Amino acid sequence: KKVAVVRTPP
């Protein structure tokens, strides 16, 4: 599955 390299940290 394609996962974003950056997101808002949890």
């Epitope: 599955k1 394609k2 996962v3 974003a4 390299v5 950056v6 997101r7 808002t8 940290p9």
Partner: antibody, heavy 127, light 105 residues
Framework: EVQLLESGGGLVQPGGSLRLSCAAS????????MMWVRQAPGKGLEWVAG????????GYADSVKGRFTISRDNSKNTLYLQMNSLRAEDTAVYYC????????????????????WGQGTLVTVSS | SELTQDPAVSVALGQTVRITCQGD???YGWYQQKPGQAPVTVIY???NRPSGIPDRFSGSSSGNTASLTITGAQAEDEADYYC???????????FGGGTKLTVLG
């Protein structure tokens, strides 16, 4: 259909500010990480800034960091780029760019995941 | 990082052209741009062709090299092709200097 439409472009003095706007239709902006790409006359594409789905993380190219501010209004389906203390080297057609996959799959700097491009808005930084 | 592509390439009308891009560990996009126009996505995510793009456009990504193949080159394919990808060192988006395609014959 997916449509991205930018405004805010024009002639500005060196040291001046310009606010770019990108209005998204045919999809929900909040489901996507977004980015700004620019192109100097007769030159190549260059990534400027990127933002996450809720705007928790932003990213900028080395040359615009500290002067430019990428922001978004999910409620208005609009992406913004505040460009302060502009220089002649910032003269370019500025495009709004949309990743093909949602915020969980494609991040704002993944410039290989773009499926939709804006019409572009010309920024002229001249005295 | 940065993305490397040849500034120019030529193909005879009706033949096959392969445009390469050089980078490391990436998810590649291919964007067609005509002189007065905005870019158009011909391929994204190495091989994903958007609906509406003719199937004469195909994308392949081998070990540290992305490829855009245009089978049966038509007069309307004469444009600038840019490769896009991710720069993990810097944390930003990267583009190749572009490849202007000339459809001869």
């Amino acid at each position: 259909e997916v449509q991205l439409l930018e405004s805010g472009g024009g002639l500005v003095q060196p040291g001046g500010s310009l606010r770019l706007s990108c209005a998204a239709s045919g999809f929900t902006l909040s489901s996507y990480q977004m980015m700004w790409v620019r192109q100097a006359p007769g030159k190549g594409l260059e990534w400027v800034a990127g933002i996450t789905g809720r705007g928790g993380v932003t990213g900028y190219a080395d040359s615009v960091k500290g002067r430019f501010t990428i922001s978004r209004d999910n409620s208005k389906n609009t992406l913004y780029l505040q460009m302060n203390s502009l220089r002649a080297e910032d003269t370019a057609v500025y495009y709004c760019a949309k990743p093909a996959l949602d915020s969980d799959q494609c991040g704002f700097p993944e410039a290989g995941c773009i499926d939709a491009w804006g019409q572009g808005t010309l920024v002229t930084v001249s005295s | 990082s940065e993305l490397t592509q040849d500034p120019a390439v030529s193909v005879a009308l009706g033949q096959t052209v392969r445009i390469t891009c050089q980078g490391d560990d990436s998810y590649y996009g291919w964007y067609q741009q005509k002189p007065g126009q905005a870019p158009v996505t011909v391929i994204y995510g190495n091989d994903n062709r958007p609906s509406g793009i003719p199937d004469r456009f195909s994308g392949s990504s081998s070990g540290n090299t992305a490829s855009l193949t245009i089978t049966g080159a038509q007069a309307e394919d004469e444009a600038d092709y840019y490769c896009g990808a991710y720069d993990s060192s810097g944390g930003g988006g990267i583009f190749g200097g572009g490849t202007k395609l000339t459809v001869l014959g």
